[PDB]
Amino acid sequence: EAELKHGRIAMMAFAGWLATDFGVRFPGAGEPYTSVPNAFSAHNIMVDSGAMWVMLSLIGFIEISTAAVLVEVSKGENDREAGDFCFDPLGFCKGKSADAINTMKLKELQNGRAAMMAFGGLATQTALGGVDFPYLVPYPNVAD
Amino acid sequence: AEKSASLPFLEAPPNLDGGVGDLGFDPFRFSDFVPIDFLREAELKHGRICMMAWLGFVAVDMGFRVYPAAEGFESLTSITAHDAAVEQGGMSQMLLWFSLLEVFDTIAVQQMLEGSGRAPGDFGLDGGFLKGKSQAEIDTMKLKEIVHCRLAMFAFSGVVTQAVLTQGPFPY
Amino acid sequence: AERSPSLPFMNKPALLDPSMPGYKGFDPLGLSNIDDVGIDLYWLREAEIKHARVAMLAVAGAVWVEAFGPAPGCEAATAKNQMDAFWQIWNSHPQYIAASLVFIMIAEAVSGISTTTGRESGEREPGFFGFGSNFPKTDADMKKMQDKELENGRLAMWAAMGLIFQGSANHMGGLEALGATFN
Numbered sequence: 001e002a003e004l005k006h007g008r009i010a011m012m013a014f015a016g017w018l019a020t021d022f023g024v025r026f027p028g029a030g031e032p033y034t035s036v037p038n039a040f041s042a043h044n045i046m047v048d049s050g051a052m053w054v055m056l057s058l059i060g061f062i063e064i065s066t067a068a069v070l071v072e073v074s075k076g077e078n079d080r081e082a083g084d085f086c087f088d089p090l091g092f093c094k095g096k097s098a099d100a101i102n103t104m105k106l107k108e109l110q111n112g113r114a115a116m117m118a119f120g121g122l123a124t125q126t127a128l129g130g131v132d133f134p135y136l137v138p139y140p141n142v143a144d
Numbered sequence: 145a146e147k148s149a150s151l152p153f154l155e156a157p158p159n160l161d162g163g164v165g166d167l168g169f170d171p172f173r174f175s176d177f178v179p180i181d182f183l184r185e186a187e188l189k190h191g192r193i194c195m196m197a198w199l200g201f202v203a204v205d206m207g208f209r210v211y212p213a214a215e216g217f218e219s220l221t222s223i224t225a226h227d228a229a230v231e232q233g234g235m236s237q238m239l240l241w242f243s244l245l246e247v248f249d250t251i252a253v254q255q256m257l258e259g260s261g262r263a264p265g266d267f268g269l270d271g272g273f274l275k276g277k278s279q280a281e282i283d284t285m286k287l288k289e290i291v292h293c294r295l296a297m298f299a300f301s302g303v304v305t306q307a308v309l310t311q312g313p314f315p316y
Numbered sequence: 317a318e319r320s321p322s323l324p325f326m327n328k329p330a331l332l333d334p335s336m337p338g339y340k341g342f343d344p345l346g347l348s349n350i351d352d353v354g355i356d357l358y359w360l361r362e363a364e365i366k367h368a369r370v371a372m373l374a375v376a377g378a379v380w381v382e383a384f385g386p387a388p389g390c391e392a393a394t395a396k397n398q399m400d401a402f403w404q405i406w407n408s409h410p411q412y413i414a415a416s417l418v419f420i421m422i423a424e425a426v427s428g429i430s431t432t433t434g435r436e437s438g439e440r441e442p443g444f445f446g447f448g449s450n451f452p453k454t455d456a457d458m459k460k461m462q463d464k465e466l467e468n469g470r471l472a473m474w475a476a477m478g479l480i481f482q483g484s485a486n487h488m489g490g491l492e493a494l495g496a497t498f499n
């Protein structure tokens with residue numbers, strides 16, 4: 001469960017970081033969002049704005065609504081599998097061979113693991129050096 | 145389902161009687177702890193005092209005053225009469241006589257509770273109004289008192305509060 | 317059912333029944349299964365209904381004052397946030413506000429008594445007070461209406477909270493705030 005969750009969250013974060021770097025802002029958004037210089041600096045400005053707080057409350061609701069299932073499983077009263085939230089709107093895997101569902105889920109895991117590792121550099125490198133498509137750090141120059 | 149008429153969403157309180165003014169309105173069920181007759185006497189007493197009080201308060205303010213007024217007792221409003229009466233001694237006179245009556249009332253209430261047969265609030269003085277009339281009308285008159293008594297309590301309370309809150313003429 | 321409509325990944329709430337008005341099988345924390353400290357489903361049901369009714373009236377009233385202005389006799393409150401407005405009148409005619417609270421206390425107390433006893437006896441149904449009890453008919457209508465009551469009530473609850481919180485910060489009217497965002 002943790003591995004899947006961490007991976008999904010990481011993949012999401014990576015996309016957002018780059019998109020924000022590219023400049024993408026909310027459709028109809030305002031100065032607070034537009035003014036943000038770089039993703040590396042968004043967290044602080046957003047927490048100051050208060051929007052981060054709003055996100056926290058929403059995320060918390062999701063966590064509590066979906067977490068209870070684990071207890072039910074431990075109780076032995078349900079047979080749901082890890083990561084199975086019965087979520088398939090576009091039916092990509094609806095009516096698919098089990099083997100294929102297996103490769104698909106593995107694909108998610110593989111991509112997720114990659115993203116988790118990816119985020120690390122997307123963070124440490126940026127902190128020490130600067131934010132860019134490569135997010136590299138000036139080797140000769142100081143980093144911290 | 146034995147629902148109080150006043151409160152259609154609540155079971156009618158037991159321990160109550162079927163006497164005049166019994167609309168099943170006893171949400172807190174005081175009747176469970178205290179004999180009903182005692183309570184009925186109290187209701188009447190409070191109301192009868194309030195009815196009389198309202199009339200007096202209003203009239204004094206409107207201007208009706210004893211002609212041979214005592215010291216002061218002029219340029220005084222109902223709101224300010226209590227202290228004046230106290231110093232003049234009128235309050236003392238009233239307290240004395242009222243207290244004496246309450247003493248005899250105490251003896252009456254006890255007998256009523258012991259089973260003398262006295263109806264709560266009945267002291268015998270009817271002016272002949274109830275003389276000759278049947279239970280139907282007797283009860284009707286009693287109900288009318290009760291209604292007036294309950295209404296009077298609201299009235300007096302309002303007049304006093306308003307008056308002090310907004311010093312002014314009879315209509316506050 | 318081994319599943320809930322709202323949450324298709326977990327088993328259905330046992331106590332909760334589709335028959336009950338407003339049922340959508342949504343009780344992740346299983347709060348329905350509570351019977352302690354004087355709290356049970358009956359209490360919860362009654363509570364939801366009360367919250368909904370109060371909230372609905374609140375949003376309407378606030379909007380009405382902002383849109384159609386204060387009522388005759390009340391002109392001291394000019395604020396359009398319906399928050400300072402409260403304070404405006406509270407500093408002008410605090411009597412009416414306080415008086416209303418007095419009556420509410422008594423009514424609420426009797427209501428609590430009815431709920432307590434009614435729950436034990438089973439004579440009353442959560443939410444019933446007699447008002448417009450004869451309005452519905454065929455019972456199917458009652459059920460439909462019922463469900464609706466909760467439907468708009470839940471929505472109203474969110475809305476009401478927004479107004480009270482937003483006004484406490486933006487220092488501006490709700491309708492005009494909406495306009496600003498839309499302008």
Ligand code: CLA
Pocket residue numbers: 193194196197198199200201203204208209210217218220225226229234
């Ligand atoms: C709740 C009862 C009550 C109390 C405590 C007071 C208290 C007071 N009144 Mg008041 N009053 C009352 C009722 C009451 N009144 C009623 C009902 C009336 C209508 C007549 C009046 C008319 C009245 C006047 C005209 C004046 C007062 C005044 C006063 C003050 C001085 C006392 C005085 O002069 O009494 C005098 C009281 C009366 C003359 C009332 C007479 C009522 C009749 C005679 C009694 C009826 C009895 C009834 C038929 C059967 C009952 C018998 C038995 C149960 C007792 C004092 C603050 C004086 C004052 O404050 O001046 C500044 C004053 O001038 N009162």
Ligand code: CLA
Pocket residue numbers: 370371373374375376377378380381385386387388390393398401402405412413416423445447
């Ligand atoms: C949650 C409900 C709620 C609350 C808390 C308020 C609170 C307030 N309103 Mg208001 N209002 C509401 C709903 C509400 N309103 C609704 C639904 C409408 C119509 C859509 C209005 C229309 C309205 C106007 C037009 C005005 C106010 C005003 C006010 C303020 C003055 C207080 C007042 O009315 O004096 C106390 C006096 C009263 C409350 C008299 C009304 C009494 C009603 C008729 C009975 C109560 C209903 C009853 C309890 C329901 C029974 C349910 C249960 C017993 C079964 C106060 C901040 C005034 C103000 O200053 O504006 C800011 C003003 O001018 N309101």
Ligand SMILES: CC(=O)O[C@H]1CC(C)(C)C(=C=C/C(C)=C/C=C/C(C)=C/C=C/C=C(C)/C=C/C=C(\C)C(=O)C[C@@]23O[C@]2(C)C[C@@H](O)CC3(C)C)[C@](C)(O)C1
Pocket residue numbers: 039040041042043044045119120123124126127
């Ligand atoms: C200012 C503003 O508003 O934004 C601010 C907000 C805030 C919060 C202040 C900031 C921050 C702090 C952040 C984001 C900190 C995050 C830090 C993070 C994410 C740190 C992960 C490290 C992962 C590691 C080390 C993994 C190593 C992995 C190692 C060493 C391995 O050996 C992996 C491997 O062995 C496996 C497992 C198997 C092998 O087969 C393969 C190999 C051998 C390679 C920022 C960044 O400043 C931005």
Ligand SMILES: CC(=O)O[C@H]1CC(C)(C)C(=C=C/C(C)=C/C=C/C(C)=C/C=C/C=C(C)/C=C/C=C(\C)C(=O)C[C@@]23O[C@]2(C)C[C@@H](O)CC3(C)C)[C@](C)(O)C1
Pocket residue numbers: 011012014015087088089090091092093111112114115117118119120121122125133134135136
């Ligand atoms: C069935 C159905 O209903 O349909 C679908 C519809 C819908 C909603 C779309 C669904 C979905 C799927 C979603 C949303 C999938 C999202 C997937 C996503 C977003 C996957 C990101 C991966 C990111 C990676 C791999 C990053 C690599 C990063 C790498 C390899 C890097 O190292 C980059 C690097 O920069 C670092 C970090 C550091 C630098 O020094 C070095 C370089 C430059 C190399 C659902 C829920 O499934 C249902």
Ligand SMILES: CC(=O)O[C@H]1CC(C)(C)C(=C=C/C(C)=C/C=C/C(C)=C/C=C/C=C(C)/C=C\C=C(/C)C(=O)C[C@@]23O[C@]2(C)C[C@@H](O)CC3(C)C)[C@](C)(O)C1
Pocket residue numbers: 398399400402403424425426427428429432480
């Ligand atoms: C300024 C502005 O514009 O925004 C404003 C909006 C607004 C709303 C005005 C504001 C607010 C908030 C407040 C304080 C709103 C008032 C809220 C409140 C406090 C509402 C509770 C009454 C509860 C009581 C008395 C508790 C117990 C009563 C109990 C426990 C009972 O005895 C009931 C009883 O049932 C038991 C349990 C057992 C039964 O057997 C017996 C009975 C029936 C007797 C703010 C903060 O000012 C912000």
Ligand SMILES: CC(=O)O[C@H]1CC(C)(C)C(=C=C/C(C)=C/C=C/C(C)=C/C=C/C=C(C)/C=C\C=C(/C)C(=O)C[C@@]23O[C@]2(C)C[C@@H](O)CC3(C)C)[C@](C)(O)C1
Pocket residue numbers: 372373375376379447448449451468471472474475476478479490491493494
């Ligand atoms: C003898 C007797 O009396 O029997 C009675 C019985 C009984 C049952 C009482 C009766 C009834 C029925 C009654 C009283 C029904 C009342 C129903 C009612 C009052 C139902 C919904 C309100 C919902 C709203 C306002 C929803 C959303 C409000 C929303 C969604 C908002 O967005 C507001 C908004 O603020 C936000 C959040 C953002 C702001 O920035 C801007 C705006 C303004 C857009 C009878 C039949 O009449 C007669």
